[PDB]
Amino acid sequence: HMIKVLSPAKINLGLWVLGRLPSGYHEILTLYQEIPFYDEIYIREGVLRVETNIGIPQEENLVYKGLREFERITGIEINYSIFIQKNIPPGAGLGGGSSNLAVVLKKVNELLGSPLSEEELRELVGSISADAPFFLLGKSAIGRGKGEVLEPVETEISGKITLVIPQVSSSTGRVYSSLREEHFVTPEYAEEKIQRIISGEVEEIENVLGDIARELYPEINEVYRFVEYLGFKPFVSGSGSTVYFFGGASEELKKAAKMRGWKVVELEL
Ligand SMILES: Nc1ccn([C@@H]2O[C@H](CO)[C@@H](O)[C@H]2O)c(=O)n1
Ligand SMILES: [Cl-]
Numbered sequence: 001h002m003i004k005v006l007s008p009a010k011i012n013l014g015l016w017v018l019g020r021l022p023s024g025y026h027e028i029l030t031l032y033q034e035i036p037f038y039d040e041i042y043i044r045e046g047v048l049r050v051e052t053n054i055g056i057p058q059e060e061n062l063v064y065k066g067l068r069e070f071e072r073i074t075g076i077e078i079n080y081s082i083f084i085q086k087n088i089p090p091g092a093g094l095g096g097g098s099s100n101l102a103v104v105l106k107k108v109n110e111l112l113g114s115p116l117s118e119e120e121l122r123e124l125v126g127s128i129s130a131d132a133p134f135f136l137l138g139k140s141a142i143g144r145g146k147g148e149v150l151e152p153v154e155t156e157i158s159g160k161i162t163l164v165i166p167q168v169s170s171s172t173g174r175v176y177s178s179l180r181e182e183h184f185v186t187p188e189y190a191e192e193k194i195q196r197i198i199s200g201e202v203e204e205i206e207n208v209l210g211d212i213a214r215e216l217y218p219e220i221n222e223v224y225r226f227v228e229y230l231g232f233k234p235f236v237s238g239s240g241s242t243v244y245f246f247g248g249a250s251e252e253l254k255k256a257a258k259m260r261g262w263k264v265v266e267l268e269l
Contacts, residue, residue: 093238
């Protein structure tokens with residue numbers, strides 16, 4: 001009866017902030033890209049539990065929060081034991097928690113005769129994480145609003161991408177909170193940037209949350225500077241901590257990573 005579901009990561013191929021919302025959130029423009037980098041989620045019939053291999057408490061886990069809201073909305077008891085093998089580190093800017101939430105809930109909804117429609121499911125996961133609705137789509141999509149208003153697109157981006165992930169966990173809240181008015185841009189500026197990236201101009205990627213994350217967490221800056229030294233343009237996903245570049249990992253990078261406690265992920269798009 002136990003089943004396995006894969007939970008993919010994303011990167012932001014550019015992110016812009018338009019301004020503050022009264023709710024405390026921020027209006028943004030970003031290009032989401034799903035990457036072949038997965039948590040392994042095992043689902044079995046049993047008492048409701050959500051466990052990970054990295055000691056995330058159950059009450060703080062977004063999957064648990066979503067399953068309980070599912071129980072609440074539906075009146076149906078969730079009799080599933082969830083174990084998540086976390087390959088995607090929390091605070092990496094890769095949406096691992098949000099992906100976990102989307103994929104488990106999509107799956108549990110299906111297993112229970114689909115009481116929630118596709119709009120309702122997207123509402124549920126979106127109310128917990130703005131990054132979660134993207135993972136109900138996958139592939140490539142422009143995220144507008146807070147990220148949850150999605151437009152599927154076809155990009156001309158392919159080939160090698162290497163993620164370099166330092167041990168430090170970046171707080172998405174602490175970074176967003178550091179945003180001054182000089183960091184904001186008009187949506188017209190950002191919309192022009194995104195279409196160039198979509199057409200394959202990766203040099204057009206930028207992300208002000210990365211700029212700020214590099215100064216709040218000096219180790220993100222060290223990774224960034226190290227990638228430059230290796231001869232590549234570095235880019236930052238989410239609010240950090242992940243730095244990515246379009247190329248392969250050399251032995252010198254792999255050694256630096258092993259010494260420094262960085263995680264290196266070699267992907268092909
Ligand atoms: N579009 C978004 C998305 C996220 N956030 C900030 O990040 C924290 C964790 O998601 C949220 O609590 C919030 O502070 C934001 O300001 N705007
Ligand atoms: Cl960037």
